[PDB]
Amino acid sequence: PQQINDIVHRTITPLIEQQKIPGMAVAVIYQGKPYYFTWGYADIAKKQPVTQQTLFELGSVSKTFTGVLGGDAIARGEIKLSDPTTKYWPELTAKQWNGITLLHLATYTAGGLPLQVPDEVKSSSDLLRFYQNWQPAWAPGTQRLYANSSIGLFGALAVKPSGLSFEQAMKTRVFQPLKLNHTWINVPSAEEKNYAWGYREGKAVHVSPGALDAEAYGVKSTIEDMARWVQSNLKPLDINEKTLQQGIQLAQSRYWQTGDMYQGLGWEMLDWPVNPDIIINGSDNKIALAARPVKPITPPTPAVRASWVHKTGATGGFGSYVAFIPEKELGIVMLANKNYPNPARVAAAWQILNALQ
Numbered sequence: 100p101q102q103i104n105d106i107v108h109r110t111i112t113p114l115i116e117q118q119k120i121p122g123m124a125v126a127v128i129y130q131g132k133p134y135y136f137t138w139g140y141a142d143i144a145k146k147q148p149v150t151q152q153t154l155f156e157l158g159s160v161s162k163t164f165t166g167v168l169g170g171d172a173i174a175r176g177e178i179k180l181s182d183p184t185t186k187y188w189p190e191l192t193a194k195q196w197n198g199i200t201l202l203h204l205a206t207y208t209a210g211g212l213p214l215q216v217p218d219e220v221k222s223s224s225d226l227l228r229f230y231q232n233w234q235p236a237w238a239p240g241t242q243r244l245y246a247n248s249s250i251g252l253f254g255a256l257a258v259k260p261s262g263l264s265f266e267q268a269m270k271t272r273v274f275q276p277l278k279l280n281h282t283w284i285n286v287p288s289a290e291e292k293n294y295a296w297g298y299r300e301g302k303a304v305h306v307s308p309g310a311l312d313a314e315a316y317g318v319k320s321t322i323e324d325m326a327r328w329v330q331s332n333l334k335p336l337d338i339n340e341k342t343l344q345q346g347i348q349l350a351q352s353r354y355w356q357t358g359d360m361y362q363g364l365g366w367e368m369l370d371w372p373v374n375p376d377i378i379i380n381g382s383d384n385k386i387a388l389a390a391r392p393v394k395p396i397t398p399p400t401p402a403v404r405a406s407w408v409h410k411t412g413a414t415g416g417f418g419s420y421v422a423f424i425p426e427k428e429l430g431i432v433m434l435a436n437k438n439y440p441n442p443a444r445v446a447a448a449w450q451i452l453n454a455l456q
């Protein structure tokens with residue numbers, strides 16, 4: 100009702116002004132049904148406003164789709180996170196890849212894979228040389244270092260038993276079954292009219308191509324489809340497809356623990372209620388991008404409902420954030436065309452959701 104429109108206005112409006120966000124779209128999920136809000140422009144020079152059909156670069160929020168697609172493949176019996184990486188890429192005959200499993204790739208625990216794939220890596224033979232010549236800093240399953248090269252390789256290998264490409268597998272197994280008809284890995288030409296421009300220090304920019312970009316940060320979506328993406332993760336039991344339903348639960352399963360944070364397949368969870376300063380300060384890159392020791396969780400804790408599930412994402416000129424609480428049936432999406440600091444995103448999201456709790 101009006102309780103939602105009040106808390107969103109008194110929270111996002113100061114956030115937009117303090118961060119000088121050119122355009123923003125927010126979706127609040129309350130008791131299943133979503134509520135949408137828009138501000139600012141999708142194109143500054145053309146003065147095109149932000150609509151419910153405006154495309155935003157999700158950035159690293161794409162990893163949530165990759166983890167769900169990975170869990171879906173686990174439910175189909177095509178892969179196991181315990182399987183060696185070499186089972187799906189035999190040409191990776193390097194000695195350091197002994198014992199590195201798909202779980203180590205998916206949860207950034209392979210031993211120190213770099214944050215980003217190098218810029219010069221473009222062909223599949225370039226990917227091979229990059230992973231063959233990579234030297235780990237720690238043993239498998241000991242240190243967690245957030246890395247696009249880690250989970251990005253997991254997504255490309257998880258779809259090999261299906262025979263489909265990563266783009267086609269994400270379409271026919273995740274996007275289409277959830278009716279995400281406006282979420283694309285590659286934006287079609289007829290949909291570029293809704294493709295908003297990102298802004299990095301005034302200049303309009305889009306995400307540039309890169310190796311394993313679709314698996315790590317290359318997905319774009321609208322505020323309507325992202326809200327439906329939260330409904331699916333809030334209530335996986337409402338999905339008819341069995342493997343996709345189980346894949347969403349496997350993504351929210353707890354495989355590693357660092358402090359009070361649990362690592363899933365793309366998603367990151369903390370027990371609810373949460374100390375807000377932990378998720379706010381923990382979202383800063385000095386903490387989130389740093390290496391941290393992990394403790395295994397065997398067996399992986401099934402999807403705990405009383406949890407705070409969240410994921411930040413950013414590109415050159417975009418800054419997205421998603422957070423939901425399955426027990427309260429509460430969720431929020433924050434899509435902005437500016438890469439403003441992560442702590443401002445989690446602070447505004449917790450204030451909105453705790454008032455609706």
Ligand SMILES: *C(=O)/C=C/N[C@@H](C(=O)O)[C@](C)(Cn1ccnn1)[SH](=O)=O
Binds near residue numbers: 160413414
């Ligand atoms: C997760 O949120 C990843 C974000 N990546 C962004 C960024 O850090 O802004 C990019 C994709 C970094 N990157 C990886 C490979 N090449 N660039 S953006 O800056 O290109």
